[PDB]
């Protein structure tokens with residue numbers, strides 16, 4: 048690509064929303080679209096990217112930004128971790144995520160109206176939540192009604208391609224779930240999600256469905272990988288964004304210009320950073336690093352919101368986890384690896400997560416005096432999910448998961464279940480993404496501020512207790528549990544649970560909100576059309592725009608944001624669409 052080139056649209060960051068916006072805008076083959084991306088351009092060529100069972104091994108790989116981020120910052124406890132995994136490749140974090148495809152609760156999306164007006168509520172957003180996907184049910188295992196969740200887009204999705212050997216696992220987990228009086232549910236896509244479900248995945252035929260599927264075989268898309276953004280090109284007199292400056296592998300600075308619009312899609316952490324490096328952010332934060340303020344945008348990098356998770360591992364009877372097939376080397380692994388290389392069948396093509404629970408835990412919360420005081424203090428409404436939303440997403444990963452055990456060694460023997468207790472409706476104040484310096488090659492400073500509010504600790508403790516009650520007492524599954532790893536979860540002591548939750552928690556990998564959609568610059572940084580407040584020809588389309596975090600894994604809302612962004616761009620450029 049030649050220095051100084053003009054394109055109709057420039058997408059900065061070839062990630063999840065970025066490739067969505069780019070591929071959609073290229074559907075007029077006459078429209079020129081450029082994508083600049085820090086990582087490789089050929090992820091479909093990388094077996095670890097395309098193979099679903101390899102997803103966790105991508106942590107700390109060359110495709111992981113591997114940021115340091117502060118998980119918790121309380122007066123009694125603070126912890127910083129590395130890596131906070133983020134995709135560094137075309138496809139962004141959709142090239143290394145764990146595939147689950149779930150929208151979230153209608154009541155939550157309706158509340159986005161406070162930020163985006165009526166067009167950002169559940170009903171208008173449903174088509175955008177489905178437009179990216181083509182649904183498949185090859186083994187004809189699920190209700191025909193659910194083909195509605197795919198609108199026909201280039202991301203193939205399916206219910207998990209079930210591992211045959213895990214069917215006893217699945218059958219005892221289901222029995223245990225029902226034995227605790229909690230519903231089963233398969234249609235979690237119409238605004239309601241109460242119960243245990245067979246999840247859908249961005250996996251089809253044993254292959255990962257990443258956002259790069261949007262931007263291939265489209266000659267009007269110029270893809271420039273391996274370039275690192277320096278700054279957006281802003282004209283102050285015009286108050287207009289003209290393009291972007293990037294740095295190449297050889298250390299050369301290139302300017303690419305957009306003749307219509309630039310769309311910033313660098314994800315929740317680098318989008319606020321690049322905005323700030325370009326003169327759009329909190330004015331004193333900018334001054335403190337020698338950056339001129341073009342627009343005093345107080346919310347840039349603020350309102351970082353994520354889900355905390357406390358994972359825990361149980362060792363289970365042999366044959367009720369996949370550790371011995373996929374994790375440990377030997378004939379069993381060689382066998383399924385051999386089958387995969389010939390036709391991409393077998394469990395090597397599995398994302399290892401097939402049942403997911405979305406419970407409320409009201410009866411656990413009610414046993415805590417502090418929760419009772421707080422609910423009464425909120426006028427009798429549950430502080431976490433006052434509109435009936437789930438309290439947790441419980442991922443039952445059917446193997447020891449290194450990506451959820453950041454400080455314990457991998458067990459040398461045995462089969463395991465990794466339960467990821469994900470608090471999806473926390474009430475802690477948000478964190479922030481701040482600049483370390485004006486250096487584009489340094490990571491922003493990242494504070495997730497998990498568990499700022501003690502009530503989130505109480506909730507997370509009870510979500511662990513719920514999960515333990517389910518697996519140790521529930522019918523059928525109670526017989527499968529051999530031991531706890533690496534030691535007993537101290538559920539008999541509230542005070543020990545306090546320490547355990549803080550010390551064992553991690554990100555569930557759903558950061559949002561750092562450039563949020565809003566009605567004005569005093570509320571957020573982009574408007575309901577995703578235009579940056581105070582700047583012409585600049586939109587943001589990624590997780591940083593999300594104003595209230597969905598009640599589940601978030602890749603579905605992030606694709607929807609990209610789809611809607613492209614539609615609102617097309618509607619404005621009528622001479623092109």
Ligand SMILES: Cc1cc2nc3c(=O)[nH]c(=O)nc-3n(C[C@H](O)[C@H](O)[C@H](O)COP(=O)(O)OP(=O)(O)OC[C@H]3O[C@@H](n4cnc5c(N)ncnc54)[C@H](O)[C@@H]3O)c2cc1C=O
Pocket residue numbers: 059060061062063064065083084085086132133134135136137138139140141143144145146147148149274275276312313314315317555556557558588589590591600601602603605
């Ligand atoms: C472990 C992991 C596990 C999960 N698990 C599941 C899952 O199971 N299901 C689910 O729904 N969500 C999952 N998620 C959340 C879900 O994946 C995430 O929320 C969405 O994928 C987020 O979608 P954006 O579009 O908002 O952000 P993006 O990062 O994709 O794209 C940004 C792009 O910009 C480029 N880029 C950045 N900076 C520069 C720069 N300086 N110069 C030049 N280029 C730069 C950068 O290289 C990248 O290409 C999971 C993510 C992680 C891990 O990140």
